Design an enzyme around this catalytic site. Structure first.
Site, PDB file in Angstrom:
ATOM      1  N   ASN A   1       0.312   8.884  -0.287  1.00  0.00           N
ATOM      2  CA  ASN A   1       0.545   7.629  -0.998  1.00  0.00           C
ATOM      3  C   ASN A   1       1.302   6.595  -0.179  1.00  0.00           C
ATOM      4  O   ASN A   1       1.503   5.473  -0.659  1.00  0.00           O
ATOM      5  CB  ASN A   1       1.213   7.880  -2.360  1.00  0.00           C
ATOM      6  CG  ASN A   1       0.282   8.531  -3.333  1.00  0.00           C
ATOM      7  OD1 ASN A   1      -0.895   8.172  -3.405  1.00  0.00           O
ATOM      8  ND2 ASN A   1       0.784   9.502  -4.081  1.00  0.00           N
ATOM      9  N   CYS A   2       1.710   6.929   1.041  1.00  0.00           N
ATOM     10  CA  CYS A   2       2.334   5.924   1.896  1.00  0.00           C
ATOM     11  C   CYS A   2       1.341   4.803   2.153  1.00  0.00           C
ATOM     12  O   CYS A   2       0.125   5.017   2.146  1.00  0.00           O
ATOM     13  CB  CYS A   2       2.768   6.549   3.227  1.00  0.00           C
ATOM     14  SG  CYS A   2       4.213   7.620   3.066  1.00  0.00           S
ATOM     15  N   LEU A   3       1.870   3.595   2.346  1.00  0.00           N
ATOM     16  CA  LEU A   3       1.044   2.407   2.524  1.00  0.00           C
ATOM     17  C   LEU A   3       0.017   2.624   3.627  1.00  0.00           C
ATOM     18  O   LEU A   3      -1.112   2.161   3.506  1.00  0.00           O
ATOM     19  CB  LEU A   3       1.913   1.187   2.856  1.00  0.00           C
ATOM     20  CG  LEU A   3       2.411   0.284   1.715  1.00  0.00           C
ATOM     21  CD1 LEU A   3       1.266  -0.560   1.160  1.00  0.00           C
ATOM     22  CD2 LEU A   3       3.100   1.103   0.622  1.00  0.00           C
TER      23      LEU A   3
END
EC number: 2.8.1.-
Length: 103
Positions: free
Chosen positions: A101-103
């Site tokens: 879910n990190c950018l």
């Protein structure tokens, strides 16, 4: 050093990681790794080997508390790793992929 990296800057192949590769990746943080960091990164790799994916922020901190030391927390990791992006860069410097879910 010419590392093979993915679109996120993470190793394509986690099995070619070693401490020199970790230090190469840590250069973008102006961070000289010490044995403190190497022990933390060993635990991050252990998580990946046990469960097959990179840990998210809260599970990463909990796993380090259980596996390394109860004194590790987000603030300590931010100080020691020169970044507030703890889940991203602990995975990156450990040679494993970016948490989903990190950018």
């Amino acid at each position: 050093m010419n590392l093979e990296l993915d679109q996120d800057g993470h190793l394509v192949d986690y099995t070619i990681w070693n401490p020199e590769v970790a230090q190469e990746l840590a250069k973008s943080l102006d961070l000289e790794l010490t044995d403190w960091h190497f022990e933390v990164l060993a635990a991050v790799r252990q998580f990946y080997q046990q469960f097959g994916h990179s840990p998210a922020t809260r599970p990463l901190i909990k796993f380090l508390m259980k596996t390394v030391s109860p004194d590790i927390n987000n603030a300590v990791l931010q100080q020691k790793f020169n970044t507030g992006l703890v889940a991203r860069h602990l995975s990156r410097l450990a040679g494993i992929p970016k948490p989903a879910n990190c950018l």
